[PDB]
Amino acid sequence: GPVPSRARVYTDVNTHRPSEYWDYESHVVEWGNQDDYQLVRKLGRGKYSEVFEAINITNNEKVVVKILKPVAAAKIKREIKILENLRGGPNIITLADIVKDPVSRTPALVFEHVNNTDFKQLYQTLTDYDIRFYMYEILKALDYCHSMGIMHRDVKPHNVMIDHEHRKLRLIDWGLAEFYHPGQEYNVRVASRYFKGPELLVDYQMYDYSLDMWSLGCMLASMIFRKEPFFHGHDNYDQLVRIAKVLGTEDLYDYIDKYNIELDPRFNDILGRHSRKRWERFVHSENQHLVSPEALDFLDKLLRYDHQSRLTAREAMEHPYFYTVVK
Ligand SMILES: CCc1ccccc1-c1ccc(CNCCc2nc3ccccc3[nH]2)cc1C(F)(F)F
Ligand SMILES: CCc1ccccc1-c1ccc(CNCCc2nc3ccccc3[nH]2)cc1C(F)(F)F
Ligand SMILES: CCc1ccccc1-c1ccc(CNCCc2nc3ccccc3[nH]2)cc1C(F)(F)F
């Protein structure tokens, strides 16, 4: 069968934690008062949530209310546990309260209010410096959550809120996040299609924090090449075909051989044979101001088939791409 794998960093963080910390079922529910909140306007949605701007009437403070649909509602204890473990961490969204509607019994998570610059404004105005600055802010969040034994598993632009006026960023929607345990086989039906790592697409279950580094690379390729999404698959099989048309089929086969991964028997018919593409093929007059040899070297070090070969979040912060960022 497949060859085992473990994270190269933060391998044993969750073993130092006591037992029964893991048994969260009818444990520390602690519901707040829903009547403290008045919904003001809809901000947007998650896949299984509706998000509102609200007012806390006991103190007139602006907050964010995330109403959970049944799919997200079922995993609420894990999202609560993860949000509480990471609270106060760099660029992590702050959970402020947990409430339930007594009429529908639907639960909601209440957060610190964070400004969210409109996506159209961000897409046209972020400079080469802005991209380096915000990517460095996301790495601070990923290194922190990875150091705490947690993988986000849904890194994408929609899960990144930017208050551009105050140069502030938050990594949000920890609903798919999970605790990393060495040797554990995880569900591959995580992240969003366009941001799924090759490990997920080839059904390699023993993945780790490195999956977040792949998704971050997809996000970066989209920002510097102004091509959203960068890898635009029609389904999960085609998603791997989109990646192979850029990274090539030779390194993909070296990857599946290294881990002894068995693919669907029709693999050759959809994957074909493709050379590695030069990054310069994606460069044109409208995005050339966002591309540098450092950017491409960084992208190259994130977007690798082999999850063990990708930069960790801490190594990524050391890359020359970030030398012009004020630290
Ligand atoms: C391809 C993305 C992109 C390319 C080039 C420049 C900027 C962006 C971008 C554009 C928008 C955003 C902001 N994302 C937050 C969206 C959002 N609003 C929410 C409201 C409610 C719930 C979730 C929410 N998520 C972040 C980004 C980001 F993070 F910089 F990539
Ligand atoms: C249905 C939305 C919901 C979904 C999931 C969890 C909680 C709620 C909820 C449930 C109740 C309230 C507070 N409702 C107060 C409404 C109200 N204001 C009044 C002012 C004067 C007189 C009567 C009034 N009734 C706030 C909320 C809130 F803000 F969404 F959290
Ligand atoms: C142990 C079963 C087995 C024995 C012999 C040959 C193949 C497999 C196999 C092995 C794995 C899977 C699961 N799906 C593979 C994932 C995948 N992603 C692809 C993307 C593109 C092309 C093929 C792809 N296959 C399905 C299968 C299946 F369906 F049984 F064939």
Residue numbers in the entry: 3 to 329
Q: Could you share sentences copied from the article?
A:
CK2 is a serine/threonine kinase that is a key regulator of many cellular processes and is involved in cellular proliferation and anti-apoptotic mechanisms. In vivo it exists mainly as a holoenzyme composed of two catalytic (α and/or α′) and a dimer of regulatory (β) subunits, but it can also be found as the isolated subunits. Unlike most other kinases it is constitutively active and more than 300 proteins have been identified as CK2 substrates, making it probably one of the most pleiotropic proteins in eukaryotic systems. Hence, CK2 has been recognised as a highly promising target for anti-cancer therapies.
